[PDB]
């Protein structure tokens, strides 16, 4: 067989778990609650053909005396039934069972890199339990693999069998990173982004188990990357007016783009480091036209990958993290309704602000997911609560010099 390179973010993973082999804050728990019935053979056999459609969950990370290296394999794995309709709470006995899987931390050289399980807690109510390795897989590959699963399920049991998957393999994005890594480009864009970050600084943070507190709100007065950039100047806004910062960097992920006309599971995103200049007397439309400059003077050199730039230079570039994003579209579990809830998402980027908005919706969706050595319960409510109006002020009147306003508590 042939091998492959771990990438950089692969590698940091690999190292830290291996470094802390009793930490569990690598999985990634997800749960999808399908009311009605589900036939547990039939399921088996769509999760057979996703997992070899989507070929990241048949990768294995090996050690040997050239480097750490990955190849396809052939993954064993189980799909359990559990069947707790006797049980005096049953969402108590599921989620226990869930919780005494993801707890447990995975071997990465030899063992289960992804969970698959089925739970009935009820007649007519099923769930549908999946776990990864943040090495192998993130959220949105995840949602993808379930909504693969969803319609090849739907399909095998009314007799039809499904279409042909809208996926790439993983060995496209392998082979194209193998041959980027001897790139001239990539010396480009290396290049590039250390003459950016030179003279860089620290990185404005509001710093002092993973931490979460959701609002939602609606806001009056675009598209989607108008509010991108939005809530990007916004934060870096916020962040100057708290810490008195004129230098702020932000973390902004990327799709990293390079001729896959396909969706990849398991291709990650690279998050870019956008540093904002607050110079006095600037307002919201000067920020976020300095926001938009600056990303398009970055966005060709976007393939360099974020931990490779952290480690040709000097503990991170940014604290806080801006994901906007729509709520993924339901599911339909073989004409059923399936919704899914994320138990564990990833580690801590110090901050990470989530933004999900619904099309022709005015109410958002402010998501604050915080390191608990940085944060408390408190330092991060009140942070959104200080955020969230200082946003509702920028939105009312972009001719207002961010200095002239003055927020609250």
């Not at 392998?174 to 290049?191: H, T």
């Amino acid at each position: 067989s042939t091998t492959y390179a771990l990438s950089a973010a692969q590698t940091e993973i690999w190292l830290a778990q291996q470094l802390y082999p009793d930490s569990p804050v690598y999985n990634i728990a997800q749960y999808t609650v399908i009311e009605g019935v589900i036939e547990p053979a039939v399921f088996e056999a769509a999760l057979r053909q996703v997992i070899d459609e989507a070929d990241t969950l048949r990768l294995q990370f090996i050690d040997s005396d050239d480097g750490l290296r990955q190849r396809i394999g052939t993954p064993a794995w189980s799909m359990p039934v559990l069947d707790l309709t006797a049980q005096a709470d049953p969402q108590a006995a599921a989620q226990a069972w869930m919780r005494a899987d993801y707890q447990q931390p995975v071997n990465l050289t030899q063992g289960p890199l992804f969970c698959y399980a089925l739970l009935k807690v009820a007649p007519a109510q099923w769930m549908w339990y999946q776990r990864y390795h943040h090495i192998m897989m993130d959220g949105y590959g995840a949602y993808l693999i379930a909504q693969r699963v969803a319609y090849v399920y739907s399909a095998l049991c009314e007799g039809t069998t499904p279409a042909e998957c809208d996926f790439g393999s993983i060995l496209q994005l392998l082979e194209s990173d193998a041959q980027y890594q001897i790139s001239a480009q990539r010396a480009q864009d290396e290049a590039y982004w250390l003459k950016h970050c030179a003279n860089w600084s620290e990185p404005a943070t509001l710093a002092s188990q993973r931490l979460r507190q959701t609002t939602y709100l609606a806001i009056q007065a675009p598209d989607a990357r108008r509010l991108a950039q939005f809530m990007t100047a916004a934060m870096a806004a916020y962040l100057y007016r708290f810490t008195g910062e004129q230098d702020v960097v932000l973390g902004l992920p990327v799709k990293v783009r390079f001729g896959a006309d396909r969706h990849i599971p398991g291709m990650k995103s690279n998050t870019l480091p956008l540093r904002l200049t607050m110079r006095p007397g600037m307002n919201l439309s000067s920020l976020m036209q300095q926001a938009a400059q600056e990303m398009q003077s970055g966005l060709r050199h976007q393939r360099y990958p974020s931990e490779a730039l952290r480690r040709q230079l000097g503990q991170r570039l940014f604290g806080t993290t801006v994901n906007v994003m729509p709520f993924d579209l339901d599911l339909s579990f073989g004409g059923y309704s399936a919704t899914n809830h994320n138990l564990l998402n990833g580690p801590a980027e110090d901050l990470m602000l989530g933004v999900y908005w619904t099309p022709g919706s005015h109410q958002l969706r402010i998501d604050f997911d915080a390191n608990p050595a940085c944060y408390t319960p408190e330092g991060l409510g009140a942070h959104q609560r200080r955020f969230i109006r200082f946003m509702q002020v920028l939105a009312a009147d972009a001719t207002q010099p961010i200095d002239s306003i003055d927020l609250l508590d």
